[PDB]
Write a protein that binds this ligand. Structure first.
Ligand code: CL
Ligand code: CL
Ligand code: CL
Ligand code: CL
Ligand code: PT
Ligand code: PT
Lengths: 254, 254
């Protein structure tokens, strides 16, 4: 009926004594690997106090191991590395691209545990996916300030004389399997000036169905009359309504 | 004696006595109609001293006449009115159109000498001839401010994106028998933008031989290069030179 003394001394491991120094038979003491040490899977990490005041045998069960690889935005830890914590020197793990990222063939998606207990240099093996080419807007313009990769933003404009109809911008969002543009290409439609005013005792030289930006209309008085204002007027617009340069000339009189 | 006294007194007429008061037989004295007066055609205007110191008979030979019809630009006196100077009250003359004018049937080409010794009111019996239809200008405009009659002036313009080549105006001048357009219609030629600049590490999507107004050129970076700028630029045509909307997008980098 004798108690057990102090547990055996295990290298790189510290036992949880619970402030005790003597333990009754059938006492199980568990060790915890020291800093930079991860318990070797399948190894005895504890001791029991047996008859004759004797502790059960126990061998070193800790190996200097890497910390769980740091999360990456481009890729994730494949299985089963994604659930492991024991990473002794020489341990290599494999990654798999996230969404929306794509594999850079020329580069390896593997990380190694260096002697110094750190993961080998990180390379861009998982490169950002690139949305389809914007295209082109008829009588409009697309602005790609920072490429068209996953996360980029592009804007749309309408050339002078045209009003934009649709989305004014678009984002390279991730959509399921691949990547796509948030909003669709708008349309740059041609602005039209309201029918040119008609004048008393005068007429419009060759009238047209519609008048667009920079388009003019020339007037002509009737035999025996005179103008009062500009002879012609042109279709203004600016941003983004169609407007005539000014009032129409004037004929008089009789 | 063989002499004559003073010549008979003729109304509205004054005789040329030549400093003398007595005249020897066979002396012929001539009278000159007074102001506002013209001598009657085919009528004696002179007396002769005959035997017995007696002057030959003489009757009034001076009316009472208008003045040579005032010069007009449209019409010209007919024959023989164009050579006459004796125009007593009631005298009516006929005109004939000049070049390039034409008679206006509805109106009479005759002028009368009124009691007040003036010509009846002048009407436009000889109107201005008209010039052929100016026609039209492909991608251009013709400005007819005051009809196209003889003497009129018309201007020519070139629609946006086109440069005028030829006469910028024309006048309806008389061409022998008729009146014709001084100069021939000009040419509305299409302005071209200087060859679109090229960018480093990029290319022009489907380059063209020439670029006209509102025509654009889309750029494309080279693999591994990010396009930073306006995905495309268009050719703005400003009165009246061809210019690119702006700078071309860029490809980085390095
Ligand atoms: Cl692009
Ligand atoms: Cl005017
Ligand atoms: Cl005018
Ligand atoms: Cl681009
Ligand atoms: Pt005018
Ligand atoms: Pt582009």
């Amino acid at each position: 009926m004798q108690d057990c003394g102090l547990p055996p001394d295990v290298p790189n491991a510290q036992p949880a004594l619970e402030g005790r120094t003597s333990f009754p038979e059938d006492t199980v003491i568990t060790y915890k690997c020291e800093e930079s040490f991860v318990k070797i899977p399948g190894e005895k990490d504890s001791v029991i106090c047996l008859k004759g005041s004797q502790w059960s045998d126990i061998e070193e069960f800790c190996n200097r191991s890497c910390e769980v690889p740091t999360r990456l935005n481009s890729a994730s830890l494949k299985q089963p590395y994604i659930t492991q914590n024991y990473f002794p020197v020489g341990t290599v793990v494999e990654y798999e691209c996230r969404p929306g990222y794509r594999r850079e063939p020329s580069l390896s998606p593997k990380l190694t545990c260096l002697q110094n207990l750190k993961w080998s240099t990180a390379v861009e093996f998982c490169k950002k996916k690139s949305c389809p080419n914007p295209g082109e807007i008829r009588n409009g313009q697309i602005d790609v300030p920072g490429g068209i990769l996953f996360g980029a933003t592009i804007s749309f404009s309408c050339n002078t004389g045209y009003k934009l109809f649709g989305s004014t911008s678009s984002f390279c969002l991730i959509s399921g399997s691949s990547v796509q543009w948030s909003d669709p290409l708008p349309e740059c439609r041609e602005i039209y000036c309201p029918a040119p005013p008609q004048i008393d005792n005068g007429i419009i030289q060759g009238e047209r169905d519609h008048y667009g930006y920079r388009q003019s209309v020339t007037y002509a008085c009737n035999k025996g009359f005179t103008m009062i204002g500009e002879h012609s007027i042109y279709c203004t617009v600016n941003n983004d309504e169609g407007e005539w340069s000014g009032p129409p000339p004037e004929c008089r009189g009789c």
